[PDB]
Structures are given as C-alpha cells and as structure tokens.
Amino acid sequence: PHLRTFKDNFQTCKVEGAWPLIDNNYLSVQVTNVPVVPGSSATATNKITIIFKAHHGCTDQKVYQAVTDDLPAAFVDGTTSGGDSDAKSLRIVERESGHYVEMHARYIGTTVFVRQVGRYLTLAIRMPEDLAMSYEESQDLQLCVNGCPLSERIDD
C-alpha cells in the first residue's frame, strides 16, 4: 500500500504479510497487508495492531487491534482508556459514526487514527519528533522511519 514516512516522502510498497510501521520504546504499530487482486504486487491493509507500551504511573499497557469489518472503539481487553480514572492519559474514541476511530495518547503527545475504507484499513499517526526517534538501534526496521526495504517497493 501507499506509505507516508515521518520524513515526509511517499512510497508504494508490497510489504505483503506482517510489517512494523513503528517499534520503539513507547509504541508498536503492526500491519498485515495483502494483495488487492490475486497475483498482484499492489497491496492493502487488513489488520492493524497498536501497542501502547506501559508508562510508569500514566497507563498500563493497552492494545488496539482492528481488522476488515471489525473496527471497535475499544482495546482488546474491552476498555476504552488507560490507567487513571481522573487522567485520560490514553483514551480511544469512535468517529464519523464508527467509520473510523482515533486514539489520544496525551502522555506521549501521539494521536493515532484507524479507518475502514471498503474492505481494508487506513492508518494515520501524528507523533512528537524526539519520541518517534527513541527506538534503540538494530530495532531499525520501522517503515515510518526508514521506509520500505528497496526490494519491497513497486517503483524501480
């Protein structure tokens, strides 16, 4: 599918199967993509997983997962928010009467959107610069940071 990296450039990649968009000390975002028509190189996203990693005292770990035709406004555990009752440090909301949902992680100034478009999912993330770059090295494979490996790209 069509990737927009943190560094503001576009790429169209196959990246069929499971792929990490982000994989850092605060957040993991994982997508499963699949060919839009059989035997084709062009792909779309049918599963999106997010892990908001535990931030001592702010939220415990929470996990969003959505798939084609199952786009909940809650985390896997049924909850709609993270940790403290008084603090909405992490919360998730339904939007456009259900057609997309958005997650506000105030604790890491990060906003994440997941949407169903026909039979697949789009994803959008807005994240602070420093926290995005927080990933330890040899943890290098994050599509949002580095883009697709060249071999996985449609435009030679």
């Binding site: 499971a18 792929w19 993991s28 199952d70 909940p72 049924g78």
Partner: protein, 201 residues
C-alpha cells in the same frame, strides 16, 4: 405510575468466563423478601468485537450468574424489573472484568524476510494471537533447518511481549529455515504457530 429501576448493581468476578451480578429492589420489603410474580431481566455486553449486541436473562432472584464470557474482557451489566404489565427502565450500569486465561490460539501472520544489506540476518514479523486471553508478557521463537526435528531440539529464542518484529543474526546462506512462534501471558504459554518456511539468499 412508572416502576423504579433496580439499584446497587454489582459484579463479582468468579473466573475468566464467569461473573455474578447482584442488585437491589427498593420496591420490596427490606432485608428481605420476594412475594409476587414479578421478574428481573439482566443484560450484558462488551465492546469487543465491534458492535456486539446485548445478551439477556430472565430471573426471579436478586442475583444472576453470567457464564461463557471471553477472558480478560471488561463487560457491562444492567438490570430491569417487570411486574405483569409494568416494567422499569434499566439500572445504573455496572462493569466487571473477567480474569486472564492462558492463550489458546497461536500468533497470527508470521512473516519472514531477509534483512536489507545483511543476508545472514533474517527478520521475523507477526501479529498477536486472536485468543491471547490476557496481557501478552512475551513470545518464543522456534527455528530449525530440519522442519521435522523434535520441538525441544529446535533453537529457542525468548522475546518480549510488546514487540511484533525480531531479528535473528548469524545464519547460513542459501539455506531453508523454518519458524514457529508462541505466545505467553501471566497464566502460561499458548499454542505454537504453524511452521513458516523461508530460504536465505
């Protein structure tokens, strides 16, 4: 004219699949009695998956046992009374969340590729189990060149719970490797994923 709704609704979690609901009826003589052909109707649902519709139960007692729930899942609960023609609206909704269970599906979408620039290194990506049944505290990656080797003779690589990609270095080129992954949570280890075959360049 309109009947009061029941109050003081509480969940007491009993197991990963089971919660007891109790409630009070201020309508009735206190401490306590049930004397007429009224009944309570109990409803319950969660948010996962998207758009569950409610479940129902009729009960003549001020307590009901809700079974067959998903583990590690928050449920909401409310009660209404009916007496012949008159019913009430629903009670204050009360929440309760089931205990964890060991995971029961394998990790999904196991995807394997060689790393750009370094072919002796491979990368494993996957997705969590759909029946994780609890907070995933880690995974375990298995690999072998002999797909039929007894499982305990495969190479075992432990992995943290919050990462869905991992690197394994220092392999042989032009070599078929096979991979299985498994999930773990606070209650133990889930089943192993199907072996996925990948060949180094």
């Amino acid at each position: 004219t309109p009947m009061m709704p029941p109050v003081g609704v509480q969940a007491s979690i009993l197991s990963h699949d089971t919660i007891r609901i109790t409630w009070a009826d201020n309508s009735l003589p206190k401490h306590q009695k049930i004397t007429d052909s009224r009944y309570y109707t109990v409803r319950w649902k969660t948010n996962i998956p998207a758009n569950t519709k409610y479940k129902n139960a009729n009960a003549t007692t001020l307590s009901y046992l809700v079974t067959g729930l998903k583990p590690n899942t928050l449920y909401e609960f409310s009660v209404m009374v009916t007496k012949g023609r008159r019913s009430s609206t629903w009670s204050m909704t009360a929440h309760g969340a089931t205990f964890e269970l060991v995971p029961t599906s394998p990790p999904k979408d196991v995807t394997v590729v060689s790393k750009e620039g370094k072919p002796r290194t491979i990368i494993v990506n996957w997705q969590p189990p759909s029946e994780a049944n609890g907070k995933i505290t880690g995974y375990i990656i298995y690999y072998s060149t002999d797909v039929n080797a007894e499982i305990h003779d495969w190479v075992i690589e432990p992995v943290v719970g919050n990462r869905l990609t991992h690197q394994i270095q220092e392999l042989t080129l032009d070599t078929p490797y096979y991979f299985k992954i498994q999930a773990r949570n606070s209650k133990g280890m889930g089943p192993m994923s199907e072996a996925v075959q990948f060949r180094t360049p």
